[PDB]
């Protein structure tokens, strides 16, 4: 459980690492809707999430189990799949980052 959360922290660090930066970078910080001209973003996405928030929650010991952590990471991807047309580049980047997440998350210590 402590062990499971360390696995989660390792994943998080990987998702933030240089190795994945080419597709992970849109997920590094909260969506700035005004900056992007996306004035409908917060009407469509009721629960924003991003990797810096996941990181803060982990550093603050907010996550009590792996399932809670996974739910936030997956929310982040779902927000992207909900807001953007499925043929947009940002969606391809999300799918690639999600593949990295899901395959390593699956190796949960038990
Ligand atoms: C106008 O609509 C947008 O730009 C989306 C809201 C936005 N697209 C993008 C986006 C659009 C095109 C490319 Cl190639 C990459 C990211 C986006 C860009 C960012 O730059 C700091 C941060 C977040 C996003 N992002 C995420 C995550 N989900 N949607 C987006
Ligand atoms: Ni889940």
UniProtKB/Swiss-Prot annotation:
Entry protein name: Bromodomain-containing protein 2
Function: Chromatin reader protein that specifically recognizes and binds histone H4 acetylated at 'Lys-5' and 'Lys-12' (H4K5ac and H4K12ac, respectively), thereby controlling gene expression and remodeling chromatin structures. Recruits transcription factors and coactivators to target gene sites, and activates RNA polymerase II machinery for transcriptional elongation.
Domain of life from the UniProt record: Eukaryota
Effect of residue 84 to A: Abolished binding to histone H4 acetylated at 'Lys-12' (H4K12ac)
Miscellaneous: Some specific inhibitors of BRD2 that prevent binding to acetylated histone are promising therapeutic molecules for the treatment of cancers or inflammatory diseases. ABBV-744, a small molecule, has been tested on tumors with success: ABBV-744 antiproliferative activity is mainly restricted to cell lines of acute myeloid leukaemia and prostate cancer and is able to displace BRD4 from chromatin. GSK046 (iBET-BD2), which specifically inhibits the second bromo domain, is a promising therapeutic small molecule for the treatment of inflammatory and autoimmune diseases.
Cellular localization per UniProt: Nucleus; Chromosome
Family: Belongs to the BET family.
Domain notes: The first bromo domain specifically recognizes histone H4 acetylated at 'Lys-12' (H4K12ac). It also specifically binds histone H4 acetyl-methylated at 'Lys-5' and 'Lys-12' (H4K5acme and H4K12acme, respectively). The second bromo domain recognizes and binds histone H4 acetylated at 'Lys-5' and 'Lys-12' (H4K5ac and H4K12ac, respectively).
Coiled coil (residue ranges): none
Quaternary structure and interacting proteins, as annotated: Homodimer. Interacts with E2F1. Interacts with (acetylated) STAT3; promoting STAT3 recruitment to chromatin. Interacts with CTCF; promoting BRD2 recruitment to chromatin.
Positions of the Bromo domain: 1-108
Record gene name: BRD2
Native organism: Homo sapiens (Human)
């Amino acid at each position: 459980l402590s062990e499971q959360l360390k696995h989660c922290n390792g994943i998080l660090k990987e998702l933030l690492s240089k190795k994945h930066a080419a597709y992970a970078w849109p997920f590094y910080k909260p969506v700035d809707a005004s900056a992007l001209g996306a004035h409908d973003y917060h009407d469509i996405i009721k629960h924003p999430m991003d990797l810096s928030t996941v990181k803060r929650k982990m550093e603050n010991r907010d996550y009590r189990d792996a399932q809670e952590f996974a739910a936030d990471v997956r929310l982040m991807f779902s927000n992207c799949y909900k807001y953007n047309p499925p043929d947009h580049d940002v969606v391809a980047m999300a799918r690639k980052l999600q593949d990295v997440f899901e395959f390593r998350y699956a190796k949960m210590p038990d």
